[PDB]
Amino acid sequence: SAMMYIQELRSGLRDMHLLSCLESLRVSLNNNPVSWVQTFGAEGLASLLDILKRLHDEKNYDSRNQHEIIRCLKAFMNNKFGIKTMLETEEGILLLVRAMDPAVPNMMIDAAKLLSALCILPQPEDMNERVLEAMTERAEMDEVERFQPLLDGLKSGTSIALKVGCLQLINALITPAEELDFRVHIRSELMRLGLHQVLQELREIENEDMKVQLCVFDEQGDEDFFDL
């Protein structure tokens, strides 16, 4: 069962058969105990990450399949083992950051979330540093500024859920940081990119979750300029 998924994920499947099995896998990972998830383990993770990389790296079912993986990832990581095992990967943090394509906003939402939750993790470390480095890594791959995908998601046309998502990741990248000069440096690089013009707009919006992330962004911004 755990083992047949892996076998199937290593079998060269494509398109709807891939989608369908990923969907199946998603429920499996969601409904099953943590022992089944270890059974699926790093070998299972690695095969999801392998297909993900192939989809990221190529260009009808691509977006959906990338998304369904990102969904499978959420489930795998809904326990300690899965969190540890993702963070043990060479490339998995990076393949999440690469899932933040403003053109596919709901997978971006799901990927931004999981990155934000890594950032606020009690153990490991500064996982925010690890996420930034991955964003750096991605920026020169795609030849864009590193915080640009995030500012693209705060654009006026996009869904409130995405807006919330991006601002929430900004907040997860900054809050956990111990250095003031790092924090203000990040804040400042974002404002250079056009964040100040967007906050004006975001601050009009009717949403409680949006109001919450703006409150966090503002209050920490105040206290930092006050400290400095």
Binding site: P33, S35, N79, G82, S116, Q168, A172, T175, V212
Partner: peptide, 20 residues
């Protein structure tokens, strides 16, 4: 052995408690 770990983190983010 307990699930819903990610689920705890997503909720602390969403409300604002995480920050901190």
């Amino acid at each position: 052995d307990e699930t819903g770990v990610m689920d705890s983190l997503l909720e602390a983010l969403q409300s604002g408690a995480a920050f901190r």
